[PDB]
Amino acid sequence: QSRAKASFDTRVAAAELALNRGVVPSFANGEELLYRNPDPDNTDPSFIASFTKGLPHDDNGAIIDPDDFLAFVRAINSGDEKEIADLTLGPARDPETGLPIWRSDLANSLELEVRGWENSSAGLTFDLEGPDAQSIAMPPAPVLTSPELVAEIAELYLMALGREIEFSEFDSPKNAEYIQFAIDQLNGLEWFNTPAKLGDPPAEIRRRRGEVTVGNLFRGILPGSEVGPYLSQYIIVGSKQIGSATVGNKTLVSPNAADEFDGEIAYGSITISQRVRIATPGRDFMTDLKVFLDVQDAADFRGFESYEPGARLIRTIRDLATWVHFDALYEAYLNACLILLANGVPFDPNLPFQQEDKLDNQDVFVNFGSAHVLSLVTEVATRALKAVRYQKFNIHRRLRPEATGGLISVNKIAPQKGESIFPEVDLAVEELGDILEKAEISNRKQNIADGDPDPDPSFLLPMAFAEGSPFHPSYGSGHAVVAGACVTILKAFFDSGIEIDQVFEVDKDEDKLVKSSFKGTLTVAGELNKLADNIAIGRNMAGVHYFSDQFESLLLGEQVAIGILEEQSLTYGENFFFNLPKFDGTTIQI
Amino acid sequence: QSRAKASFDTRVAAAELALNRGVVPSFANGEELLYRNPDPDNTDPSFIASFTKGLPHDDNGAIIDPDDFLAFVRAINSGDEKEIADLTLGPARDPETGLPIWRSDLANSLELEVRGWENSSAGLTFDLEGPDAQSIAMPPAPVLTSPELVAEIAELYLMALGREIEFSEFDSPKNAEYIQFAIDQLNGLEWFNTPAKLGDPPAEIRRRRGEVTVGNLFRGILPGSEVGPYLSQYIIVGSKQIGSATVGNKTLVSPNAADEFDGEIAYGSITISQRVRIATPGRDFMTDLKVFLDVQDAADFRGFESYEPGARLIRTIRDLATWVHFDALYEAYLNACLILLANGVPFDPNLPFQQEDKLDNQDVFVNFGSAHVLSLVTEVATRALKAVRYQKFNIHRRLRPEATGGLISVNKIAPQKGESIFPEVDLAVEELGDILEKAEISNRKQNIADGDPDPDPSFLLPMAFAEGSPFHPSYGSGHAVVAGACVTILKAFFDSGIEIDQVFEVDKDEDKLVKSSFKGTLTVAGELNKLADNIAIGRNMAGVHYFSDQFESLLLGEQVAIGILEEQSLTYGENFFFNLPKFDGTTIQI
Ligand code: VO4
Ligand code: VO4
Ligand SMILES: [O-][O-]
Ligand SMILES: [O-][O-]
Ligand SMILES: [O-][O-]
Ligand SMILES: [O-][O-]
Ligand SMILES: [Ca+2]
Ligand SMILES: [Ca+2]
């Protein structure tokens, strides 16, 4: 037949495959309308558990006008630029300067303008490849009164309090007091100590973590994420440098071969440095209620974070948070791909032409080679992003962990001032008492450093980011959906079962890589899963995402990648499949 | 309609749009079957102008068996893995060790195995997004007897002899002798001094370079690649580093802000160094006829290049060749995108939600934002690569410039030994006498450095790469097609008319960036065109591509990118278009 007609039929067949996968219906947790305004004569929803950032908020963290959120949801579902622009973003504005009146003196002195919702209708964007953004569903997010939300918030608060603690010293006596504290309180939560009961949602069973130990503290549940050092090799270690190739029987060593162990990736003929920008240690954000409310009212605090000179390999929790702050969409997984390519990590052996050219007479660059995987790992990211944007904006609209910390802080402060507000976070306040007292101490320290000599007692979740979370709902996670999708692409494309012989940790003292004490075996699949773990949890340690957001959007990204892979497989006439270890432990052939 | 049905309809609509663009028929130059075996009783084609690398070659650079090339073409068209594996790749093999007998002692002592054709059938791969690999045509490649081929190989010979000459010193007296020589020889070629005649093919007229000066020597013809310094800003300069953002009225400065002028791209929270690995200066490859013939017989010389320790900003021509040797598919253009995103270069103003958030209430990350452009610039590359693989393997199969230099060298050596061979490169030999004599001197020097105390006189095109070209035909260029596609994506997505206030050159003495002497204005569109120029002509500086390969592959990539953009525009409900300045000076709205 015609080549153009064959191309049309291949594209139509891929669309038919995407359509025949069906639409998994996306269910919210019902929090949007279940929580009501505390005012006895006001029956409108409070929307406290809903992502209400940017809409004008009262002094307690709830929005003044529930209609303001209703218009926001309508604009989400419609996608119209005029309806988005007609939304009220930020607080009341000064008639003279045109600038919004901020609650905090910091945002008023900066003359901060409002920041807008980041692609509130990207979930309505169609996808030429892979699953449609609305064809796949994440499960309902945990509700505020759920023990899962309490466990997630405890994890977030402990990460915020443990931001300056280095990953290589999780078991070290120096951090033993904070590590044992975190382990004790997490294991004091019925989410961690008590297993899932029969009849619980399957995703609830899947994402439930057991007893928290130092070996799995702040770690994911992906296979290989809990095995070995905390940080993935691909997030800290470099790669085989230019010149370290083998030419027949002669093995030439790169003159820059030490750059592999100095965290430098062979990025073509130039280098990607794995060293992260050093955010100011101990400097958290939105620890003051006025600044937090301004951020909830869309105060653009982007770029307000201060940084130490130079760059170091990720050592502290805050370093991982900084890494996931600015990462260029697929940058973690593009870097992992570059490491695997430079290290000569073989592609999936079921890919064609992977044998030595003595046998197949065919090198692989464009298809089943470096270029194919490099393009796939990067094209999967925007598709996963569209799906997660649909999940964030049109389905769940889950409030950010900063907003949950705001509700918890205002609830804990209410008895002190004689009031009683936000009973939905009462379980979180009660079960996180000790974590909340140390959070209050840390917030008092930060707010004294902020400029308030005698700051009000604040239990807000300390934010690694000055703007806090990105300006979209937390559930799901764009970073974690891209993590799932790109790691799925890499595990399918590369021989993910390949064992990593050299396992490196960041040195406990110096800014360098040392051979990890891990005496086990680390696979490529395990380390890619650990890298997805690292990015998603680093979103958690910034305070911008809950754990369940990360795990479920990682699954969503894996689904996006699988759909894309099945659709592109229709484009190759070669007899081949991707051996793809899924996050659930099974392998799919694509 | 249903959302799933709407997704299917959008994908099938993009497929109909791709189908309705039609198929531009792909014409070769007729060189494949026009040159015949000089043996009188043998009437089979010589296939000398055909890409015959890998197929066994005689002592003069032609293939022993035309049936070998015929089977290679049949395997190209079929794409069958078995037929590709059944192809005779490399020379005769030792029955004892199983290794092929190499003509050169270098490849025999290395026990070199064969290297396969890189995606000989990737042009048969269908594309779910954008134009089909076979729906777009690049014009016929110039023939060996054409003055265009003589000009191309002269430019390539001139680049090889000037690989150690720095871009910031093109007009410097110490290189004035080599630059004036190159200018005089190029302007002595009727391709450069004589303009295109009426009735010539329009692509020939469009790609014909006129009078060669110091300010346009070794430069492209894209708009903006001829004004300003040689190297694009994005190939050498860094970008705004993390911490240098503007927060309301306060302008925080990054503690690492000097990294922008040190050639350090803010790659999320980590950095990309623009410094390229220093290939061994004065070390060229395939200068000896035996090593060249082994490479023609698929000798795997990859990684055989040597490097000095460290990395430096691109100064010499060999540095650009090294940069394009290993660049990860979209690396130059992904780096340019990262620079434009870190620098805060505004997106296309016709993109939606690009106003301040006070007006539009919407940030752009997933759609019309950093993630969108990153994913687009990375996904256009593999589609352009498929199109160029079709052009390389199924249509043109143009011999590599190393193979052109082989024919030229054997033709020049034949009268010395009393014979005569390859009269099709007689025009190249006659018109390039001075360049060929300097190439003979340089090749003799390199072959003495290789290990031959008294090497045979060789006029081979010196190769920046030990394997020389990648194992596919030169026409078109994968790097140039990716450059065209990705730079088109960046010019469409970003406000490409934005002027770059700061223009940097690599310092004439130190490995650093100085303020360029350019008193004119440089735009983002011009600098992206210059970056595509830099990559394509760096492939020329390697000696692996001719100029026409580069320019026509850049046009093909621009077509790929435009088709992808049209097909993606159907996926967005926003009222927007990409303002896209083409390589022909016109602007398309997408
Ligand atoms: O959805 V989030 O990347 O803020 O990771
Ligand atoms: O086709 V070439 O990238 O060898 O640029
Ligand atoms: O091939 O590249
Ligand atoms: O990040 O969002
Ligand atoms: O948004 O990211
Ligand atoms: O490179 O091809
Ligand atoms: Ca192979
Ligand atoms: Ca905007």
mmCIF file of C-alpha atoms in Angstrom, chain A residues 316-549:
data_model
loop_
_atom_site.group_PDB
_atom_site.id
_atom_site.type_symbol
_atom_site.label_atom_id
_atom_site.label_comp_id
_atom_site.label_asym_id
_atom_site.label_seq_id
_atom_site.Cartn_x
_atom_site.Cartn_y
_atom_site.Cartn_z
ATOM 1 C CA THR A 316 21.246 16.844 52.840
ATOM 2 C CA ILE A 317 17.502 16.379 52.537
ATOM 3 C CA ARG A 318 17.354 20.070 51.621
ATOM 4 C CA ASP A 319 19.786 19.288 48.791
ATOM 5 C CA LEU A 320 17.313 16.800 47.303
ATOM 6 C CA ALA A 321 14.533 19.361 47.773
ATOM 7 C CA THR A 322 16.642 21.955 45.944
ATOM 8 C CA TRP A 323 17.383 19.425 43.200
ATOM 9 C CA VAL A 324 13.675 18.787 42.636
ATOM 10 C CA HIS A 325 12.935 22.520 42.898
ATOM 11 C CA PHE A 326 14.237 23.460 39.453
ATOM 12 C CA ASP A 327 14.767 20.142 37.653
ATOM 13 C CA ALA A 328 14.098 20.578 33.933
ATOM 14 C CA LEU A 329 11.085 18.277 33.696
ATOM 15 C CA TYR A 330 12.890 15.077 32.654
ATOM 16 C CA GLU A 331 16.342 16.205 33.774
ATOM 17 C CA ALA A 332 16.823 13.496 36.413
ATOM 18 C CA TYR A 333 15.902 10.762 33.968
ATOM 19 C CA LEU A 334 17.593 12.315 30.978
ATOM 20 C CA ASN A 335 20.689 12.360 33.204
ATOM 21 C CA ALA A 336 20.138 8.733 34.218
ATOM 22 C CA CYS A 337 19.786 7.895 30.522
ATOM 23 C CA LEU A 338 23.017 9.762 29.752
ATOM 24 C CA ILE A 339 24.806 7.858 32.521
ATOM 25 C CA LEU A 340 23.505 4.529 31.211
ATOM 26 C CA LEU A 341 24.511 5.455 27.649
ATOM 27 C CA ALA A 342 27.983 6.652 28.655
ATOM 28 C CA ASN A 343 28.492 3.697 31.005
ATOM 29 C CA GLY A 344 27.617 1.457 28.058
ATOM 30 C CA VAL A 345 24.678 -0.043 29.940
ATOM 31 C CA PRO A 346 23.148 -2.375 27.336
ATOM 32 C CA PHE A 347 19.702 -1.633 26.013
ATOM 33 C CA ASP A 348 16.929 -4.159 26.479
ATOM 34 C CA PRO A 349 18.322 -7.390 24.958
ATOM 35 C CA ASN A 350 14.947 -7.963 23.290
ATOM 36 C CA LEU A 351 15.450 -4.748 21.346
ATOM 37 C CA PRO A 352 16.632 -5.514 17.803
ATOM 38 C CA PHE A 353 20.188 -4.984 16.582
ATOM 39 C CA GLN A 354 21.543 -5.041 20.138
ATOM 40 C CA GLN A 355 23.939 -7.879 19.314
ATOM 41 C CA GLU A 356 27.471 -7.199 18.172
ATOM 42 C CA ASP A 357 27.515 -5.936 14.598
ATOM 43 C CA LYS A 358 29.434 -9.075 13.617
ATOM 44 C CA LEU A 359 26.046 -10.817 13.945
ATOM 45 C CA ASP A 360 23.349 -8.286 13.002
ATOM 46 C CA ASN A 361 25.399 -5.710 11.023
ATOM 47 C CA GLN A 362 23.271 -2.933 12.490
ATOM 48 C CA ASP A 363 24.141 -0.268 15.029
ATOM 49 C CA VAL A 364 21.305 1.442 16.897
ATOM 50 C CA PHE A 365 21.031 5.211 17.200
ATOM 51 C CA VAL A 366 17.668 6.428 15.863
ATOM 52 C CA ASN A 367 15.656 3.326 16.757
ATOM 53 C CA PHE A 368 16.491 1.030 19.685
ATOM 54 C CA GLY A 369 19.594 3.126 20.358
ATOM 55 C CA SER A 370 20.772 6.243 22.171
ATOM 56 C CA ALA A 371 18.616 8.718 20.239
ATOM 57 C CA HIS A 372 15.491 6.558 20.558
ATOM 58 C CA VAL A 373 15.677 6.318 24.352
ATOM 59 C CA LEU A 374 16.774 9.949 24.713
ATOM 60 C CA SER A 375 13.729 11.120 22.761
ATOM 61 C CA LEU A 376 11.363 8.654 24.456
ATOM 62 C CA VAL A 377 12.374 9.527 28.028
ATOM 63 C CA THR A 378 11.749 13.195 27.220
ATOM 64 C CA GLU A 379 8.540 12.886 25.192
ATOM 65 C CA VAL A 380 6.931 10.740 27.894
ATOM 66 C CA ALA A 381 7.354 13.574 30.403
ATOM 67 C CA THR A 382 4.898 16.053 28.883
ATOM 68 C CA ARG A 383 2.300 13.307 28.348
ATOM 69 C CA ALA A 384 2.573 12.237 31.983
ATOM 70 C CA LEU A 385 2.384 15.935 32.868
ATOM 71 C CA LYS A 386 -0.880 16.356 30.956
ATOM 72 C CA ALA A 387 -2.360 13.310 32.689
ATOM 73 C CA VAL A 388 -1.239 14.536 36.103
ATOM 74 C CA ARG A 389 -2.559 18.032 35.334
ATOM 75 C CA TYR A 390 -5.949 16.497 34.620
ATOM 76 C CA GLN A 391 -5.720 14.595 37.906
ATOM 77 C CA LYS A 392 -4.646 17.716 39.827
ATOM 78 C CA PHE A 393 -7.097 20.221 38.434
ATOM 79 C CA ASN A 394 -10.215 18.472 37.127
ATOM 80 C CA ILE A 395 -10.488 15.515 39.540
ATOM 81 C CA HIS A 396 -8.841 15.811 42.938
ATOM 82 C CA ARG A 397 -7.798 19.444 43.510
ATOM 83 C CA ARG A 398 -6.086 18.222 46.656
ATOM 84 C CA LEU A 399 -4.802 20.974 48.909
ATOM 85 C CA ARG A 400 -1.040 21.293 49.059
ATOM 86 C CA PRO A 401 0.849 20.000 52.115
ATOM 87 C CA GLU A 402 1.585 23.639 52.921
ATOM 88 C CA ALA A 403 -2.185 24.205 52.996
ATOM 89 C CA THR A 404 -2.616 21.189 55.264
ATOM 90 C CA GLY A 405 0.050 22.500 57.514
ATOM 91 C CA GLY A 406 -1.809 25.803 57.521
ATOM 92 C CA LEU A 407 -5.038 24.103 58.556
ATOM 93 C CA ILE A 408 -3.159 22.135 61.229
ATOM 94 C CA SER A 409 -1.380 25.240 62.531
ATOM 95 C CA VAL A 410 -4.573 27.303 62.685
ATOM 96 C CA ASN A 411 -6.389 24.404 64.367
ATOM 97 C CA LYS A 412 -3.627 24.062 66.972
ATOM 98 C CA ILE A 413 -3.532 27.835 67.535
ATOM 99 C CA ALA A 414 -7.329 28.102 67.897
ATOM 100 C CA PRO A 415 -7.538 26.800 71.514
ATOM 101 C CA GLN A 416 -4.736 29.194 72.494
ATOM 102 C CA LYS A 417 -6.840 32.160 71.335
ATOM 103 C CA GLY A 418 -10.009 30.514 72.672
ATOM 104 C CA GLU A 419 -11.473 29.441 69.321
ATOM 105 C CA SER A 420 -11.848 26.015 67.712
ATOM 106 C CA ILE A 421 -11.481 25.666 63.939
ATOM 107 C CA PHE A 422 -10.659 22.958 61.384
ATOM 108 C CA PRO A 423 -11.866 19.811 63.197
ATOM 109 C CA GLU A 424 -11.020 17.843 60.042
ATOM 110 C CA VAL A 425 -7.323 18.129 60.948
ATOM 111 C CA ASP A 426 -8.024 17.374 64.630
ATOM 112 C CA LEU A 427 -6.710 13.824 64.239
ATOM 113 C CA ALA A 428 -3.600 15.181 62.514
ATOM 114 C CA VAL A 429 -3.073 17.730 65.293
ATOM 115 C CA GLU A 430 -3.540 15.130 68.041
ATOM 116 C CA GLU A 431 -1.439 12.354 66.489
ATOM 117 C CA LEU A 432 1.417 14.706 65.502
ATOM 118 C CA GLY A 433 1.805 16.471 68.839
ATOM 119 C CA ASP A 434 5.552 16.029 69.324
ATOM 120 C CA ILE A 435 6.304 16.640 65.643
ATOM 121 C CA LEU A 436 4.162 19.771 65.867
ATOM 122 C CA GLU A 437 6.022 21.052 68.942
ATOM 123 C CA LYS A 438 9.384 20.674 67.225
ATOM 124 C CA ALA A 439 7.881 22.237 64.093
ATOM 125 C CA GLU A 440 6.749 25.145 66.275
ATOM 126 C CA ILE A 441 10.283 25.503 67.651
ATOM 127 C CA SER A 442 11.774 25.444 64.144
ATOM 128 C CA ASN A 443 9.159 27.911 62.881
ATOM 129 C CA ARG A 444 9.872 30.266 65.783
ATOM 130 C CA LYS A 445 13.572 30.091 64.912
ATOM 131 C CA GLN A 446 12.855 30.772 61.226
ATOM 132 C CA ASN A 447 10.442 33.628 61.948
ATOM 133 C CA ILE A 448 12.947 35.232 64.309
ATOM 134 C CA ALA A 449 15.429 34.883 61.453
ATOM 135 C CA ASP A 450 12.695 36.258 59.178
ATOM 136 C CA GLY A 451 12.490 39.476 61.188
ATOM 137 C CA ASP A 452 9.788 38.944 63.811
ATOM 138 C CA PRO A 453 11.385 39.327 67.278
ATOM 139 C CA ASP A 454 8.453 37.600 69.031
ATOM 140 C CA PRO A 455 6.643 35.620 66.328
ATOM 141 C CA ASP A 456 3.279 34.036 66.974
ATOM 142 C CA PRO A 457 3.488 30.292 67.740
ATOM 143 C CA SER A 458 3.385 28.758 64.263
ATOM 144 C CA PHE A 459 2.859 25.089 63.413
ATOM 145 C CA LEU A 460 3.024 25.636 59.649
ATOM 146 C CA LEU A 461 4.841 23.027 57.616
ATOM 147 C CA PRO A 462 8.282 24.565 56.976
ATOM 148 C CA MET A 463 8.787 25.020 53.245
ATOM 149 C CA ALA A 464 12.069 24.381 51.470
ATOM 150 C CA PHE A 465 10.739 26.697 48.736
ATOM 151 C CA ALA A 466 10.009 30.388 49.244
ATOM 152 C CA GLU A 467 6.923 30.131 47.037
ATOM 153 C CA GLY A 468 6.228 26.757 48.633
ATOM 154 C CA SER A 469 4.502 24.388 46.262
ATOM 155 C CA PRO A 470 4.061 25.085 42.558
ATOM 156 C CA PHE A 471 0.774 26.728 41.857
ATOM 157 C CA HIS A 472 -1.283 23.591 41.187
ATOM 158 C CA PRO A 473 -2.983 20.952 43.357
ATOM 159 C CA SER A 474 -0.721 18.378 44.980
ATOM 160 C CA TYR A 475 -2.512 15.232 43.750
ATOM 161 C CA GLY A 476 -0.992 14.074 41.675
ATOM 162 C CA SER A 477 2.657 15.068 41.418
ATOM 163 C CA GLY A 478 4.002 16.331 38.116
ATOM 164 C CA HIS A 479 7.540 15.506 39.196
ATOM 165 C CA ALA A 480 6.503 12.036 40.345
ATOM 166 C CA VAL A 481 4.371 11.386 37.253
ATOM 167 C CA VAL A 482 7.371 12.323 35.105
ATOM 168 C CA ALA A 483 9.484 10.130 37.379
ATOM 169 C CA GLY A 484 7.200 7.163 36.797
ATOM 170 C CA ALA A 485 6.943 7.723 33.054
ATOM 171 C CA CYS A 486 10.635 8.358 32.398
ATOM 172 C CA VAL A 487 11.833 5.571 34.700
ATOM 173 C CA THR A 488 9.388 3.246 32.944
ATOM 174 C CA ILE A 489 10.840 4.345 29.593
ATOM 175 C CA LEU A 490 14.393 3.735 30.818
ATOM 176 C CA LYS A 491 13.606 0.363 32.414
ATOM 177 C CA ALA A 492 11.845 -0.749 29.231
ATOM 178 C CA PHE A 493 14.554 0.536 26.893
ATOM 179 C CA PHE A 494 17.692 -0.374 28.823
ATOM 180 C CA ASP A 495 18.507 -3.808 30.158
ATOM 181 C CA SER A 496 17.050 -2.820 33.515
ATOM 182 C CA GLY A 497 18.116 -6.081 35.161
ATOM 183 C CA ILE A 498 21.781 -5.216 34.603
ATOM 184 C CA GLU A 499 23.558 -5.101 37.952
ATOM 185 C CA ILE A 500 25.496 -1.974 38.906
ATOM 186 C CA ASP A 501 28.922 -3.173 40.035
ATOM 187 C CA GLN A 502 30.050 0.130 41.587
ATOM 188 C CA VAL A 503 27.690 1.610 44.189
ATOM 189 C CA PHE A 504 28.601 5.080 45.440
ATOM 190 C CA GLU A 505 27.412 7.170 48.366
ATOM 191 C CA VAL A 506 28.065 10.845 48.918
ATOM 192 C CA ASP A 507 30.852 11.093 51.484
ATOM 193 C CA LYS A 508 29.692 11.808 55.031
ATOM 194 C CA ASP A 509 32.252 14.633 55.376
ATOM 195 C CA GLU A 510 33.550 15.804 51.983
ATOM 196 C CA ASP A 511 31.732 16.751 48.778
ATOM 197 C CA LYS A 512 32.729 13.589 46.939
ATOM 198 C CA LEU A 513 31.525 10.094 46.091
ATOM 199 C CA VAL A 514 32.719 7.139 48.162
ATOM 200 C CA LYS A 515 32.117 3.435 47.696
ATOM 201 C CA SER A 516 28.923 2.664 49.586
ATOM 202 C CA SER A 517 28.960 0.197 52.470
ATOM 203 C CA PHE A 518 26.057 -1.562 50.719
ATOM 204 C CA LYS A 519 27.254 -5.150 50.299
ATOM 205 C CA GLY A 520 24.275 -6.213 48.172
ATOM 206 C CA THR A 521 23.580 -5.909 44.465
ATOM 207 C CA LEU A 522 22.008 -2.898 42.754
ATOM 208 C CA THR A 523 20.284 -3.315 39.398
ATOM 209 C CA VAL A 524 19.631 -0.703 36.735
ATOM 210 C CA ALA A 525 15.892 -1.142 37.325
ATOM 211 C CA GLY A 526 16.386 -0.828 41.072
ATOM 212 C CA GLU A 527 18.436 2.341 40.708
ATOM 213 C CA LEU A 528 16.016 3.937 38.240
ATOM 214 C CA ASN A 529 13.206 3.156 40.681
ATOM 215 C CA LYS A 530 15.365 4.679 43.416
ATOM 216 C CA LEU A 531 15.853 7.794 41.272
ATOM 217 C CA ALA A 532 12.097 8.147 40.785
ATOM 218 C CA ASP A 533 11.853 7.627 44.553
ATOM 219 C CA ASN A 534 14.461 10.340 45.055
ATOM 220 C CA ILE A 535 12.694 12.943 42.929
ATOM 221 C CA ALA A 536 9.187 12.226 44.241
ATOM 222 C CA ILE A 537 10.221 12.072 47.879
ATOM 223 C CA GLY A 538 12.409 15.144 47.366
ATOM 224 C CA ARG A 539 9.181 16.834 46.354
ATOM 225 C CA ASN A 540 7.883 15.611 49.715
ATOM 226 C CA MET A 541 10.943 16.942 51.598
ATOM 227 C CA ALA A 542 10.335 20.333 50.031
ATOM 228 C CA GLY A 543 6.922 20.162 51.704
ATOM 229 C CA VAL A 544 5.109 20.523 48.371
ATOM 230 C CA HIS A 545 3.782 16.969 47.973
ATOM 231 C CA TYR A 546 2.416 14.160 50.097
ATOM 232 C CA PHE A 547 3.746 10.620 49.753
ATOM 233 C CA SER A 548 0.526 9.214 48.272
ATOM 234 C CA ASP A 549 0.603 11.902 45.591
#
